[PDB]
Design a binder for these strands. Sequence first.
RNA 1: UCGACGUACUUCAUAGGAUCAUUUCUAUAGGAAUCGUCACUCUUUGACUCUUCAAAAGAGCCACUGAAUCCAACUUGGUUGAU
RNA 2: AAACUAUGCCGACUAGGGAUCGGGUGGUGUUUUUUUA
RNA 3: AUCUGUUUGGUGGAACCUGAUUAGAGGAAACUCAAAGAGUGCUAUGGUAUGGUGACGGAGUGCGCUGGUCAAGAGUGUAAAAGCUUUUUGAACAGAGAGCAUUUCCGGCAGCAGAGAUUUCAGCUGUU
Lengths: 380, 362, 181
Amino acid sequence: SKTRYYLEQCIPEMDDLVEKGLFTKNEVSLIMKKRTDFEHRLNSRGSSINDYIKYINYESNVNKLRAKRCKRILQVKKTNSLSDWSIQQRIGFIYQRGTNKFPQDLKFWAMYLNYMKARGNQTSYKKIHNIYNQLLKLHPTNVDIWISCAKYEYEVHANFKSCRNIFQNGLRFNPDVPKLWYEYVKFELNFITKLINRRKVMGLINGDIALTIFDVCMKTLGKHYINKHKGYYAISDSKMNIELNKETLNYLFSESLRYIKLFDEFLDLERDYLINHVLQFWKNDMYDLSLRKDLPELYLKTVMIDITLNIRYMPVEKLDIDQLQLSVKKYFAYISKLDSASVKSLKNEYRSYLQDNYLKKMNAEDDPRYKILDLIISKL
Amino acid sequence: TREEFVSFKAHYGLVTGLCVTQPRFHDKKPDLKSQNFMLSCSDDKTVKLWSINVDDYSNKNNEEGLIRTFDGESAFQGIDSHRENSTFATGGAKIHLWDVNRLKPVSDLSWGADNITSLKFNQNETDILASTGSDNSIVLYDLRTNSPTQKIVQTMRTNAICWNPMEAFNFVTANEDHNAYYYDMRNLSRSLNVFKDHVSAVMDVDFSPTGDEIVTGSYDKSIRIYKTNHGHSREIYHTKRMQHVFQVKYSMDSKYIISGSDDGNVRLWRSKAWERSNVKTTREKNKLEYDEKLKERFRHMPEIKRISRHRHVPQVIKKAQEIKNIELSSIKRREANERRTRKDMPYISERKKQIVGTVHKY
Amino acid sequence: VRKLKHHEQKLLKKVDFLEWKQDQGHRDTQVMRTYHIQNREDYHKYNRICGDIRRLANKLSLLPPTDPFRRKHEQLLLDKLYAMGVLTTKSKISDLENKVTVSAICRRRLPVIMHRLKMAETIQDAVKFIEQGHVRVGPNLINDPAYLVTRNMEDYVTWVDNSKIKKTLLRYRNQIDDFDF
RNA sequence: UCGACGUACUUCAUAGGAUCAUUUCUAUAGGAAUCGUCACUCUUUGACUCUUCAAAAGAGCCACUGAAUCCAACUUGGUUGAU
RNA sequence: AAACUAUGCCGACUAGGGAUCGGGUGGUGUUUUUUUA
RNA sequence: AUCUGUUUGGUGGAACCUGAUUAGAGGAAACUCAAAGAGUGCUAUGGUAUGGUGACGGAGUGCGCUGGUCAAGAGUGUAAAAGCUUUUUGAACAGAGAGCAUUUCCGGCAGCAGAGAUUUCAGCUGUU
Ligand SMILES: [Mg+2]
């Protein structure tokens, strides 16, 4: 049987434990009896992943118990013999057998990866790559795996070359997931901020790339969203097709707004320049729908970001009157082209923005600018 | 599938030789994946190169038929092709070396005026060639020198030669004295082994690609398989419908034997009768593996010998063995009587009996 | 045993855990069932008597055919066996071998003769009535179901006077006379 | 009454092929079987209890201690309706 | 006087085994024997 | 109807004959106990069994191996070419974990500071 072969592989380890004096023969017998039940459990029918989890948990405690008797009895940190790595080798083997038997369980894969990453010295990083290669092939459509190895090789390794290739391959399999685009762009700018800081660090001691990802993201996400909500067929009625166009604009708009929030985090990059690219993107008519005509509510938000763009990142201390005038000059420009209902709502939002960010944070009696802000707010 | 890819009426006379080759023209790479080529020679004094469409791969989607013809002054009797290079050799009144891209023999090899009956290129030291003559001789050649090397004259003609796929310097010979002889290239005075089970002339011989077994076709309507380390067959294959075994071959997996007789049928046989072609579960594999070692350990027991060696051979072969056994006993009894009184009658080993002489003495 | 596979059957041709050659085909059990013999060794006690008859006949046959001694003894044996009821016919001397069998002797047992006289519906029923003391032969009650009845004594097989079975016979035909009982 | 002749009448052969029979092999290579079990469904047979056709015999007598049924009696429901 | 219980497929046809009769060749060592033949 | 007596359906099953069976033929109950047959279900998966006996593993180096680009050589072809084959060689590039050696370092001990939830890992300095 398979069990007898695996039990006999434990014998050289147990001969070592008795020989070193850490475990008595009676104690060694008790460990084998417990191991015998597990190995029979794994090699039989009806086995579940919990059996593998239980056996791995048991082996870990045996490793701990041997470790403490090693310091208590032998009084040595490491006894150069088979007993040291026999348990660790075994636990890895249980992980391999369980993963092959039950590839569907993603939790077990995570435990396997955490276990092998934890003992970095014992396990070469090359072995970690093999686990990810086999896992990725089985589940190409789980983005969390793709980001995990990308994150692992950006933090533990910091190989942007391999990490970039992971995002390149991951998006190839899952172009319809906004989440993977969000992380790849986050990685892309993360590579830039780290790079510029190195240049800044270099000086003392002596963004478009993300936008392209954003642009292709918005096109690709649109195509798949249209394919979904249509089923096997196209939609014959014209009105329904218009609605499907409206949904993707809103769905794509929410994605674009989510990227807008991401840019704010990055002080080093020229966020105003990066945001303006997004605003320019939405100016172009898309899917035969105009934002100003068909989706005004999205348009007002599009206008509002443009109005505050020059003053969005200006602290109250460095508030320049001329730049505020440019914002107000932009404010009057859009009103001349907007309807009354839109102007009122747009007026309310802009007034609240100025009041909350600048007026409420400024002392009234110390700064002449406070009077100017109130006059503008009153006139707005 | 046991079906034909193509059938060609290649020659007006008898097809005296055939080999499957992978040509390399100087200027053109033939599509080896989609086409396979075979060379045929006949007593009408011509050698023809053919092309056959095959369905090994589906990477494509013709030119199926005769490609090139070589004319010769005399009839041909045996053909074989060099494995590494494109050169191939034909054996007729003179053994000729040909190149696929030349219409005439590039080089002429011959020990003398005697004709050559067969030839077979070496499989590992691909530059070496061996041939069989009608004067009961075996001539060894080397293309690196473009000359013959060694010659030994035996008591009877040898019909076929095969080289050991795993031992570059060893080859077995099918002989007309009811025997097959295993020879070492470097020392041809003595044979390595002799296989004696057949009762008629052995007409063809072939090595298993593992190199640990040989199969011999005989004029007695039987096929016998020998272990290279033993001088007696472990098996005999026969059928009432098989009429004269003239060719025997091993499948490249060593699992099957292909035999061609003069009744016009090409049969397939298992190398080991009791084995089966299905993939075995681990429990099956170990039990069968366990049995084989268990059989080898007790092979010397009387009862196990009785059953293991028992085969039903045709009546004609059985009577031949009985008459053959009586004759050898009389000869052995008789030489024993002569040795009692004869002062000088030497002992000659069975391995050295068949050699009449060698050209280059050492 | 489970049904043997093909390769097992060829290697275990003679294996049989329920039939052996020494059983002689379970002839004893078959004859015991037919006539409801309750003692396991009754058949083989009968078999020895049959063999004694057959042995004597074989020796008699080897005497010369015209011998007065041979003819006398062979007729005497035929005379005696017919009287017991073992042999149905006296004509043929070969009957001493061919038609002398344990079934012939068992067929003269009291339960079987009751069945043939229709005193019981089955041999098993006849055995029960004998064990229950309903059957007499002549004036003697017999509770032994192995009693052999000769041809002459088959006339005296009958029910006991006070048997409840007799009352049912007479009551069914409305011919019961309680003076007798 | 037996013979001979004549007439009439009854009976008698033989083949081809395959399979099963040797604890492998019935003589043929033209053919098909070598695995240490865990469950579920169905089907056949046999036991144990009881029982019909359908009866028959009770290892037998006393004492104590439990149980079941059917009446009597009592208690509940019941013509504003039991069965 | 004689026969009187037998019998074997046949042939243009292969390779043999043991024993024996006549001749011849070779080997060997026991009988044999020696310049009378 | 102290009319008539055929048919249909139920009840009953003498005699003869034919067939099958025979320690007579049956029936009811089950989270009962046995002996067998057939089918079905289940990753039912070592083609030669974990990366590892300090007999070791990790890091590095070199060799080995892979992919195509370029250059050169050889063959073929031509007026000269272009073109095609190459188990001919070299360069740089991009690599796989998939082999071989390598003591060059680490994995004993103390201290510095960090990442993660008293425990795990990573870096540096002294020491055997
Ligand atoms: Mg017949």
